[PDB]
Design a protein around this motif. Structure first.
Motif, short mmCIF file in Angstrom:
data_model
loop_
_atom_site.label_atom_id
_atom_site.label_comp_id
_atom_site.label_asym_id
_atom_site.label_seq_id
_atom_site.Cartn_x
_atom_site.Cartn_y
_atom_site.Cartn_z
N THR A 26 0.85 -1.03 -0.06
CA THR A 26 -0.06 0.13 -0.05
C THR A 26 0.84 1.47 0.09
O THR A 26 0.40 2.23 -0.49
N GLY A 27 2.01 1.25 0.36
CA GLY A 27 3.07 2.08 0.70
C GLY A 27 4.12 2.16 1.81
O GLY A 27 4.24 0.81 1.93
N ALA A 28 4.50 2.90 2.16
CA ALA A 28 5.49 3.02 3.38
C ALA A 28 5.10 2.30 4.48
O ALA A 28 3.85 2.62 4.86
N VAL A 29 5.87 1.49 5.15
CA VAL A 29 5.43 1.08 6.61
C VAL A 29 5.63 2.37 7.63
O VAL A 29 6.85 2.55 7.67
N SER A 67 12.83 -1.96 13.56
CA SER A 67 13.18 -0.57 13.08
C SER A 67 12.47 -0.41 11.96
O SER A 67 11.90 -1.23 11.27
N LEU A 68 12.19 0.88 11.30
CA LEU A 68 12.19 1.26 9.99
C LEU A 68 13.09 1.62 9.32
O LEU A 68 13.92 2.46 9.80
N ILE A 69 13.21 1.08 8.15
CA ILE A 69 14.15 1.52 7.05
C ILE A 69 13.60 2.13 5.82
O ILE A 69 13.25 1.21 5.19
N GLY A 70 13.53 3.41 5.67
CA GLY A 70 13.20 3.87 4.65
C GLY A 70 11.53 3.56 4.50
O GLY A 70 10.88 3.82 5.57
N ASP A 71 11.10 2.82 3.59
CA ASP A 71 9.83 2.45 3.30
C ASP A 71 9.31 1.00 3.97
O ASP A 71 8.13 0.82 4.00
#
Ligand SMILES: O=C(O)Cc1ccc(O)c([N+](=O)[O-])c1
Length: 227
Positions: A26-29, A67-71
């Motif tokens: 759907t897009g970025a997490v 963590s989040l890494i970019g998208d």
């Protein structure tokens, strides 16, 4: 429905660092997807590792971090141990339902208790009530999720119940199949399945949750066979 994508397989060596990722179609997490990471070891043994993007589940080794890494979301294992060879799933929240990724098979080169019966055989057209007996925490202060896994298929969220008032939420797939209840004096969560068909054959898991903290502890699963 969104598709959650994970690497199918990854290889690491003992003592190295490895990072698994979790993508949304759907897009970025984002943190509003409340990504959780769970580990599957042989014989349907699920362990919650990380909840809500970056909180480690108490008792989990500190080499696991989210963590989040970019998208996308990421799970990093800093100094892989032999026993970390396992399947790692992420799951994402999409406003009103959970979607599991397909899992990453990680090769390593070389108090809270949720209790479920191991297996049950039932006839088609009948109903069955599966139990999830808890201990080690104040049962009314946590929700209970239910998840199933058909043979050779992925994980599917069924729904959850809040024991404080019995409020439920169901996935679209189970909204007319499952009924969740609790019995607070016995600290037990129940899931009833009606109008059973052979397609209901699966392992059914209970897993604890609450606002902001989902899938941190898992039952061992009940292998339900509908003849
Ligand atoms: O923890 C959060 O804010 C996400 C969330 C919010 C409401 C829900 O009903 C829910 N669930 O799992 O059914 C999850």
């Amino acid at each position: 429905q969104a598709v959650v994508t994970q690497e199918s397989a990854l290889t690491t060596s003992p003592g190295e660092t490895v990072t698994l990722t979790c993508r949304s179609s759907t897009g970025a997490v984002t943190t509003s997807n409340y990504v959780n990471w769970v580990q599957e070891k042989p014989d349907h043994l699920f362990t919650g590792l990380v909840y809500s993007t970056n909180s480690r589940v108490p008792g989990v080794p500190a080499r696991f971090s989210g963590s989040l890494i970019g998208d996308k979301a990421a799970l990093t294992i800093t100094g892989a141990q032999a026993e970390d060879e396992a399947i790692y799933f992420c799951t994402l929240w999409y406003s009103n339902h959970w979607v599991f990724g397909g899992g990453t098979k990680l090769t390593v080169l070389g108090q809270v208790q949720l209790q479920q019966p191991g297996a049950e055989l039932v006839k088609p057209g009948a109903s069955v009530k599966l139990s999830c007996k808890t201990s080690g925490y104040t049962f009314p202060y946590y929700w209970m999720h239910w998840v199933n896994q058909r043979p050779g298929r992925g994980l599917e969220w069924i729904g959850r119940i809040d024991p404080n008032g019995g409020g439920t939420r169901y996935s679209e797939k189970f909204k007319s199949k499952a009924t969740l209840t609790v019995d607070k004096p016995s600290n037990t969560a129940y899931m009833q399945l009606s109008s059973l068909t052979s397609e209901d054959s699966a392992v059914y898991y209970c897993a604890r949750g609450k606002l902001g903290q989902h899938f941190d502890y898992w039952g061992q699963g009940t292998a339900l066979t509908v003849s």
